[PDB]
Design a protein around this ligand. Sequence first.
Ligand SMILES: CS(=O)(=O)Nc1cc(C2=CCOCC2)cnc1Cl
Length: 863
Amino acid sequence: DRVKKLINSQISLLIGKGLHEFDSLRDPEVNDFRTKMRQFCEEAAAHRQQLGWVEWLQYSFPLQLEPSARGNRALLVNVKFEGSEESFTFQVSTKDMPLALMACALRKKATVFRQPLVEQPEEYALQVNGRHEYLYGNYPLCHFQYICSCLHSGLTPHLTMVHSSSILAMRDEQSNPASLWSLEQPFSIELIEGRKVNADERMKLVVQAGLFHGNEMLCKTVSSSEVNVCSEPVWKQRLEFDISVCDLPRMARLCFALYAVVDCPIAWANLMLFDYKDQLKTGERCLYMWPSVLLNPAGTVRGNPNTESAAALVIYLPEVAPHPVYFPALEKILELGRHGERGRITEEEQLQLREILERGELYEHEKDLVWKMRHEVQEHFPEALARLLLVTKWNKHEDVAQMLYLLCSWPELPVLSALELLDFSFPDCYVGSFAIKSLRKLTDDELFQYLLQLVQVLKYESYLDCELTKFLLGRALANRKIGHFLFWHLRSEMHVPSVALRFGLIMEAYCRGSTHHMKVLMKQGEALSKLKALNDFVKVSSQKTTKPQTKEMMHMCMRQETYMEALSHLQSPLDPSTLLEEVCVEQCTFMDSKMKPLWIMYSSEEAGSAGNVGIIFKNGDDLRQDMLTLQMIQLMDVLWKQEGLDLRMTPYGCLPTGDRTGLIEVVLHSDTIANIQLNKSNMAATAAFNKDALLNWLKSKNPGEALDRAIEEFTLSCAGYCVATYVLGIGDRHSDNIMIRESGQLFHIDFGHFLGNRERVPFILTYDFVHVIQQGKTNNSEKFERFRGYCERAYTILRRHGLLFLHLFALMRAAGLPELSCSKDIQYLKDSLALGKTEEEALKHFRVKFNEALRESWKTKVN
Ligand SMILES: CS(=O)(=O)Nc1cc(C2=CCOCC2)cnc1Cl
């Protein structure tokens, strides 16, 4: 009671919407979602509280493994026991398993504490000091990301031996507290009136209406007559459609567009013809319209919540029968679709089908052949399900029944095929259920990689309670890291009225499943609330006084009790493994740019050097495109690493958390090309030629024999970013948005422009970078051509996974990013990856592009 009221207020606070608002809608679909999902999430919570201590480690601290390890050398490791000042430094092998290291730590403990220990190594897990990261399982140490990272940076792994009893105490502490097909008449509606309409009174108003199954039209669009512009237009007219009521598919949507004619688009609104309980809709419907920026089928099927200002279309859905009409059950659908005729075809016409299912638009006659050979598609080309689904006449209830009968016995498709099936071009609910069914085999790592896309797919859903929401919720309550990012992806969009309800409802259900995590995320939102007020203070102060003055003001404001409490001891929203412990006020600052982004520095005694981390708070900028570009770069990095290619990439964290609000992970010991090239006097890098500056800077960071490895890190990362920016169409590249790490690694930042948004972005080769690759020499084709090789190999690996990028970017069209709104944006990727070409023709083309970029580079070498 007292705890329930408290939990409810904390959820309202966290999700940024009062739960009372859900109740005030007096909406049965909303109410059934809350009840079913609360039950489902509490069941997951109860399952979790009883997990074994290693299972609970898999839940809270899922393994962070190297991409090549998924599906020799000597190493120095520092190991301590929980709450011990003492530590042991010992030499292991990168090929040893954590258990050997633990047995080793236990023998050292037994000799030092003069007692033959009861404790077996099986009773322990290894924590990475001052991080929510553990090393466990039957994997050699080189396979864990943390060890791998330690090996490259030369640093020593610092591990803490944590006992099962301590892990169990964590689990305990974090518990939740105690018949349609007979109706042959054409589909029709009555267009009654419009309310709160705004337009030029010299013009006339028209309502355009159309029936859609996803993107595809179910019949021709039908328009209203030209009624005079006014606030309350009255039509009171029948809009009759060319399609029988019996042929309306389950996921049929009626789409409206109100506009003004002399074309002036005013508003749009959509609705599903069947409700969430599968009942065909009857009665009056007031549709609170969305303003138009003509028909929008991909647009939400729920009304505009701003009922005070919204234009509203009033329509009537006629009572087609004296009793309620429901969409037929699956058993009734399979019955009708059972009855068919199998395609008896010629060896030559069988060859024509193999040619098109292995080939992408088709001519009308090719569709007639794919349809006729639907049984052969199921049995010999199951991966061609998507092509067949697109030839199905979704406006014929019998063709839909024949399609559903096959789909219901269709074998589970690979993950790649299932992602294509989540596209809005497959709106059928049975197709969507099938697609999730084939996605169940996703590993938490694969799931995490595509989570951003699965969250966007939620915007295409017609109903609140769906297989994808249940899937996303079940996977998030089974993995704390999936849970963390599902939360933030939904939270960052609560300011969007079209998704606020759906997203707020998912976050509440999630919270019901993990009370403890809700409190952890509240601690994160509290820190972001203070960073917003701090960034506002900085934005005001900076335009009045100088930068060292505003910086000292920011520090004073951070030194306040409420800022010290809220900004300290939190999990990073960028990475729940990263503990943001003590705020280093003196190290904090902000940028001189328009939005004055804040740079917040942290340290942790327990984590040592690894505890020294930074976050960038941005308010005023939109970080969604950055996050998408950075996730795509990370995807490239994983794909190259699986093919044994490590291009030393830096896919740093980027996370929108609110309205034009988000975080960026600071990469320490890095500087921009512009700052290095300023060629300051009295520096360890000052050059005789500005071309030497960046090489002199690497020289000062990597003394003696260390220079060669820095140059190699530069070359690899350069080849990786050359390919990544080319494939992605990253333009507006200048010296202040390219950085370099002291290790030699080059990386790109600020990705506000991609997919050539519209001009085709050519391949880029910079002479200052070509100069580093060549080890300071004018001619060094040995080093330069090793670079061109890294480029060609990285490019040819991406092309092999070109469909993965296409399917993911197609899913992202749902995000509403202005540079990713239509089909032409995906065309850019098809071109850069030359997917209609052989590997020979594409590499030939890549070479022409790389050589073109070198002739462009030599225009600077001339001087
Ligand atoms: C210069 S800024 O205003 O802070 N903007 C920015 C910085 C960065 C990083 C700097 C060093 O760490 C890696 C990430 C990344 N993106 C942006 Cl857009």
